[PDB]
Every structure is written in C-alpha cells, then in structure tokens.
Structure 1
C-alpha cells in the first residue's frame, strides 16, 4: 500500500505528497449541501520541516498550498471524477512530461504564474456557475485543482486539468488554432519535432478538414458558442482550440508492430472531447478538440467572434 513518492525531481515528489495529503484530509471533510462564498476565498496550507526522517524521496523541508479546496472538489465531482481516482492518478507513479501528465495520461498538470492564480480566483465563482448550468458539458478546461509548492524556498504554481487528448488513443497530428488575422504558422524547429504543434496557417495550407457528421458537429458548435460567449463576458482573450487527430489504421499498425516484438473506440465519460469521424469519411479517425489557455485577462468580443467563425469552418 506504500507510497514512496519517488520521482526524478523533488518538486514532483512534493506534488505527489501534496495531492495525497489534501485528498486524504478532504475525505474527512463532509460534502456540503452547497458552496459558500468563503469557499472561494479559502485555502489550505501545510509546512513540513522533518529532521533526519523520511528523507529518501521527499525533501525534509517543503510547503504545500491548495486553493479553494471545497470548490475544486465540487468541480471534480461535477466533472465525473472520483477523488480516490484523482489521487491515484497523481500518486501511484510520478507524473511525466513546465508541462506534465499523470503517469496514466488522464490528467494534465501545468505550472502557471502568480498572475494566473489571481485570474483563476477572479473567474472561479462564474466558471463554477457555468459548469453547473452546462452540467459539465463544455469545451473549456475542466479545472480539478490548483496548488502552490514551495521547495528550496521557491514557489511554483500549478493547475490540474483533465487531458484534452485520449488517455489511451494516440494522437498523430495536433493543431493550436486561434483564428488571428495575424499570420500564425509553425517554426521549422517545431515542424521537425516528433509531434509538431501546427498553427492556423499550417491547418489552412493543408486543406485539412474534420468530418464528424451533423449530430456531433451540432453538439460541438453549440458548446463553442456558449463557451466563447462566457470567455468574452469575462473579458478574456488569447485562448486557443487544441485539436488532436488520431488515425485508427495507423494505430492498428503501430500496435501490431509492438505485438510482433475496440479500434478507434473510446469511452466518452473519460475522453470527453473525443468524436468519431463520420461513417462516410475517407480515413477512419478520432478527433479531440477543446479550448485551452483561458487564464489571460485587440478586443474580447471580436476575439470570441473571429475564433468562433474560424472553428466553425474547420468542420463539415
């Protein structure tokens, strides 16, 4: 049952310790009938100074802070995430890659700035209400936790979100689309990487299209209009749509190749941004599409409109 919190860096050990500690504490805290305003101004803070004890993986001295834990537990709940699963994903094995994924690819951990943490505080009450009235059906980031770590007297802010991508299905192309009138294409450097992060003009030059058929595409566009209206009404800009392309046949070959030494099927309760390609589409594919980078406080109404138009035009 023993959790060593072994990780290649002490900050990752402290992260694992912290998620374990906060979730265990929370398991002794009753689930409220409702959130109260103080829950949105609340935090939990722990400071450890061990001496000649338990030094194999954790530092002897560290701090851990969890922002609005009652709120983020409610968020996890409204997103269909059990707390025991969440702690297991962060602590069973060290997260990998600052940008991390939990070892099981279910959750993403992004280090952020003090400013981002402030902006999250400013938007939390409204973001939470948006999640309750859209019943968790949104393309926005699903925020599950937010933490401050102190190791070596150095503070590190982190936000945990559900992965946009599948936790099991491989992503073969990815685009970061914003819709800027300004030219946005990928560097030859980025274009030489294993999975380049292609920008908008790369998408446009390729003649790329995503064929999902009428029903899924309607659900997607309705979410998109509501989501970017929300972002505009909060005076937020610079956000992107993350797009990941999974090629089913390519996956089948890659798997049979590792085997020498369901296909294109996924659980929507888990891969919440995933859509199958239309029955009559050239290659059988799975798409993952979500809004990302929503923490940055030129016009946000215009950004909403241009974004929604460009992302309307990447489907059929």
Structure 2
C-alpha cells in the first residue's frame, strides 16, 4: 500500500511515474527483438485528480517516459529485474537534483533538454554496444529517462546504476578525466569531498587490484572509450571511490556502541563496479570505478588521454 510520501511533490510524482510505467510495461509482452520505432517511442500520462487522492501527490501533474521498450530491455541486459527497480524507487522516497533511491542501488540525475536529445541520438548505438559486450562495460548503465511536469514546470531525469556500493561506505572519492585540474577549498570542506586529477597524483594514490583484474578493467575501459570517441563524445570522467575495510569495521563498532546505550565483502551482482584490493595491498580496501558523464582538445584525443591516465592508476 504505497503512499508516495516525499519531501517534494516532484519526488512523489517520480515515485508515482516509475510505479505506473513499470506496471503498465508488465502488461506489454516482451519482444523477440526491439524495433526502430521503439527508439522514437514514448508514453505520456496526464493526471487531474479533483478533490481526490491529494494527501501526497499534486492534483495535477504529467509523466513522460522516453523509449520505454528500449529501457526495459536495457534493464534486462544489465540484470535488473523490473520489480526490483520499481521497488527501489517506490517503497520509500529517493533521498539526496542528485538523488539516490532509499536503498542506494539507483542514481537519479536531473538533466537538461539537451542531455535528453543527446540520449536519443546515441541511443541506437548504445543499445547495440551493450548487446555485443553482454552488459560488460564501465559506461553508465541507463535504466530510464523521464520528463516530469509539476506546477507547469518540466523536469528531465535519467536513472542509472549507482557506481558506488549500495552498502559499503565510501571514505574517499575522485573525479578523473586526464587533462592539464583540482578540487576547490569549498569542496575540500565537505565531509566526503570530490577530489580531482592533481589531487590524485599529488598524494601518490594507487589502487592495488591484482593483475587478473587490472586487465579485465583496462580492456573494458578500452572498448568503452573507443566507443565514446567513435560517438564524438567528450568531457566524461572516471568516478573513483575508495572504501577502507578496516576503518569501516571500526565505524560499525562505534555505531553499535552508540545504539546499545562481513568486512570487505560485496555482491558483485549488485556492487557491479567493485574490486577487492590485491592480497599484497598496504591497506585492505574496496574500489568502485566506472565511467560517468557521457551526455553533457577533442574526441579522438580525449579517448587516448583519458585512457592512459586510468591505466596508470592501477597496480
């Protein structure tokens, strides 16, 4: 019995819309293959509830889903069941627009009309490219694109798999691109600041993943970034998050002590970007690495610049 409670009406409408579209989708047979129209497709629903059901939702709102057949399939290819996805978004409000779902599995970006245009151009190729790699990629996994209308205003959203873990704590993160950058004193003030290229090198940080992994990683990064230049795309980043296993085990202990008054483990079928640090690492760690920001010097250039840098991070 879902109320769609949230801090803002926009979030209620998002919960409502993901709920409503996923249910509708489930009365729609699963196609043998996709069709070219499915990439021009969209659903539009428009609600006027007069003196009815207004405890949580506005009386009046609009929900558009772009290419709902393509993104259903995109979800299947990434191993996300539609009911799981729906539940992550509807059981309890997303919290942060840069939203996460209450359970941290899914990330919800507010985007621009441009971004949405860009999604459409690249969509045909992105699908095929997710197909021939079987979902094995460091690229953003796109699960849904939506336009919400509340109080006459329009908001564009894209849903992605969280790069970071849904359970394990991130103690330090970077945004990397590979260009001739630094996190501002304003950032450095945040609890968990987003650091950048020069911060990464300036502190000598390296990630000890182990060779069988460093290779499976750099081969992904290679297809991925060649695909991105081939599509003429630029300015993307490697998000790099670091979880210190031993420091978390202690944070836990201090969390249990307070209330009263396993470690380094993750499901690679959920924490899809996560690598254990090599037996020989100086610290017991977990990393999360994946490419972000591909909607929005040159492309052929960035590709190789970007690629050399990320290769040097690992060992």
Q: Please indicate, yes or no, whether the TM-score normalized by the shorter chain is above 0.5.
A: yes
Cα deviation code 1:62-91 (max 9, x no counterpart): 000000000000000000000000000000
CA displacement at 1:260 relative to structure 2: 1.0
2:263 matched residue in structure 1: 263
**Which blocks of at least 5 consecutive residues in structure 2 are unaligned?**
none
Structure-2 separation of matches of 1:200 and 1:73: 36
Q: CA RMSD in A?
A: 0.5
The answer to whether residue 6 in structure 2 is matched with residue 16 in structure 1 is: no
Cα deviation code 1:83-116 (max 9, x no counterpart): 0000000000000001000000000000000000
The answer to whether residue 251 in structure 2 is matched with residue 254 in structure 1 is: yes
Structure-2 separation of matches of 1:269 and 1:287: 15
CA displacement at 1:126 relative to structure 2: 0.3
Structure-2 separation of matches of 1:260 and 1:66: 46
Structure-1 separation of matches of 2:281 and 2:174: 20
Structure-2 separation of matches of 1:135 and 1:268: 16
2:275 matched residue in structure 1: 275
Cα deviation code 1:111-150 (max 9, x no counterpart): 0000000000000110000100000000000000000000
CA displacement at 1:199 relative to structure 2: 0.5
Structure-2 separation of matches of 1:101 and 1:93: 11
Cα deviation code 1:197-227 (max 9, x no counterpart): 0010000100000010100100000000000
CA displacement at 1:156 relative to structure 2: 0.2
Structure-2 separation of matches of 1:263 and 1:159: 32
Runs ≥4 residues deviating over 6 A: none
1:284 matched residue in structure 2: 284
* Corresponding residue SS for 2:173: strand
Structure-1 separation of matches of 2:99 and 2:123: 23
Structure-2 separation of matches of 1:305 and 1:134: 21
Question: What is the TM-score normalised by the length of structure 1?
Answer: 0.98
Question: What is the TM-score normalised by the length of structure 2?
Answer: 0.99
**Which blocks of at least 5 consecutive residues in structure 1 are unaligned?**
none
Structure-1 separation of matches of 2:201 and 2:278: 21
Structure-2 separation of matches of 1:299 and 1:89: 38
* Corresponding residue SS for 2:74: helix
Alignment length (residue pairs): 312
Structure-2 separation of matches of 1:124 and 1:17: 25
